[PDB]
Design an enzyme around this catalytic site. Sequence first.
Site, short mmCIF file in Angstrom:
data_model
loop_
_atom_site.label_atom_id
_atom_site.label_comp_id
_atom_site.label_asym_id
_atom_site.label_seq_id
_atom_site.Cartn_x
_atom_site.Cartn_y
_atom_site.Cartn_z
N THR A 187 0.98 -1.25 -0.01
CA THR A 187 -0.06 -0.01 0.04
C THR A 187 0.94 1.22 0.06
O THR A 187 1.76 1.55 0.91
CB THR A 187 -1.04 0.04 1.05
OG1 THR A 187 -1.99 -0.92 1.09
CG2 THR A 187 -1.59 1.46 1.33
B1 LIG Z 1 -1.94 -2.19 2.06
O1 LIG Z 1 -1.32 -3.33 1.35
O2 LIG Z 1 -1.30 -1.86 3.32
C1 LIG Z 1 -3.44 -2.83 2.35
C2 LIG Z 1 -4.12 -1.56 2.66
C3 LIG Z 1 -5.67 -1.76 3.05
C4 LIG Z 1 -6.10 -0.85 4.29
C5 LIG Z 1 -6.39 -1.94 2.07
N1 LIG Z 1 -3.20 -3.63 3.56
C6 LIG Z 1 -3.23 -4.98 2.94
O3 LIG Z 1 -2.91 -5.46 1.95
C7 LIG Z 1 -3.22 -6.03 3.85
C8 LIG Z 1 -2.05 -6.87 4.13
C9 LIG Z 1 -0.89 -5.81 4.75
C10 LIG Z 1 0.14 -5.79 4.22
C11 LIG Z 1 1.15 -4.67 4.36
C12 LIG Z 1 1.00 -3.92 5.74
C13 LIG Z 1 -0.18 -4.24 6.40
C14 LIG Z 1 -1.25 -5.31 5.80
N2 LIG Z 1 -4.50 -7.33 3.42
C15 LIG Z 1 -5.19 -7.76 4.22
O4 LIG Z 1 -5.33 -7.37 5.41
C16 LIG Z 1 -6.09 -8.67 3.99
C17 LIG Z 1 -5.57 -10.16 3.57
N3 LIG Z 1 -6.21 -11.09 3.20
C18 LIG Z 1 -7.61 -11.05 2.94
C19 LIG Z 1 -8.00 -9.76 3.19
N4 LIG Z 1 -7.33 -8.78 3.87
#
Ligand SMILES: *[B]([O])([O])[C]([C][C]([C])[C])[N]C(=O)[C]([C]C1=[C][C]=[C][C]=[C]1)[N]C(=O)C1=[C]N=[C][C]=N1
Lengths: 230, 229
Positions: free
Chosen positions: B1
């Site tokens: 993100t």
């Molecule tokens: B981004 O990659 O940080 C995103 C932001 C969210 C608010 C849309 N988060 C995610 O991709 C997260 C994983 C993550 C990555 C890096 C730091 C923190 C978290 N994804 C999930 O929480 C997720 C995983 N599997 C199913 C559904 N959601």
Amino acid sequence: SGHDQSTDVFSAEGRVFQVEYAGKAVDNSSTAVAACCKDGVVVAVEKVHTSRMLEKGSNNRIHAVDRQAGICICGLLPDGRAIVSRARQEAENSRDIFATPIRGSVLANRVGEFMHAYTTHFAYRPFGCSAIIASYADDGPQLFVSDPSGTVAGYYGVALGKAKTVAKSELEKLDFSSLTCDEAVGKLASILHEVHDKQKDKLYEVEVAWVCDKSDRKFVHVPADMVPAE
Amino acid sequence: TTILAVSYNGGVVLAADSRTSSGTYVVNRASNKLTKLTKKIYCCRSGSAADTQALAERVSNYLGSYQTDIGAGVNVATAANLFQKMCYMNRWNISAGIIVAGYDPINGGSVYSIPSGGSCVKLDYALGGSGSIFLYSFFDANYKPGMSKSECVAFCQRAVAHAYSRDGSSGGLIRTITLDADEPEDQTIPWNRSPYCMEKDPKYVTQATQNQPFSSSAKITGNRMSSTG
Ligand SMILES: *[B]([O])([O])[C]([C][C]([C])[C])[N]C(=O)[C]([C]C1=[C][C]=[C][C]=[C]1)[N]C(=O)C1=[C]N=[C][C]=N1
């Protein structure tokens, strides 16, 4: 007496006979010749077959050490295969540790220290072999000869074997500055058919090998139809 | 993100990628990290996809119930103190980096960055997410304050595209929206029309000469692309 029984015995005048007796094993061996041809090095030797039933390719005295270098031996065949299998190990070390092809003057200095280390200890005997290092490294075409004493020297041409004195005068008529690798295979093979007599052996053939720019700097043997017939 | 929000004279420009990824697998490649609170106040959204979604729609219901009782417009500083209150009293249980940016007629364009610790800092531009650490030295060199609306859109799209080229967590689309006195204009440019990518970067065309041919010299002459030569 007992002053010529091992290697760790200097004579009354500072000579080591078991080294000098090993030099008589090369002087009673088959004739070797070589030439440096300003873009490469050509090496030819005469295989004295002792029977009619030997396969063509048996007892090849020319062995490839690296892709660009190869040692032809003159003297005892099984003693020189310990020199070939050592200089291969010296050339594998530079490719695996230093990531570079071994230079021509450096591979020969590693041969002359392996052959010398067996002339200083009582339990070992010197080699009955003269190794001819023919290389083409990033220092140009190189031609070295290591004697059983461990002495290395860069040459332009060399004759080794029984008739090394008659074949040396036949090398003095060549040029080595305008001389190419194209003509010298026909010249050096014609040295061996004139310097060697058929009144002692009936089976004798020649084995030629080069490394030059035409073979893409690779140490190769000949295609069989480039050598003169007789 | 990779999320960011940049202020210009009129209002703000929100910018974000589109990818939620469960560790190493792309669960969604068309996420929407730009969450509507009110008509002119949005928030960027990084971290946990569930913990920040529950905060964003709990603030947006307090914020619309406030707007009806007031009978006027909501300030951006009002919406940024509802995330700070919730991201601080839940800071050991959630993973939430929020960038709140919007427009109000009193203060113009406002940008609030609320990190995972729960603090609130009012800024000119904000960065957030795991891909934001690439963009500090990019904004120190290439960013000049006081751009127009059309220049901040093309800059923030060029800013995110350098972020998800190196980051593995980020990628996908580029979703941007501008919040000012006009209607909120959104724009989603794809990957294949992104302003930057390393695959068409003309200095990464030459392969690094790793697979040397077996040769007689130390002269490096490139990779070996065929078995014969
Ligand atoms: B981004 O990659 O940080 C995103 C932001 C969210 C608010 C849309 N988060 C995610 O991709 C997260 C994983 C993550 C990555 C890096 C730091 C923190 C978290 N994804 C999930 O929480 C997720 C995983 N599997 C199913 C559904 N959601």
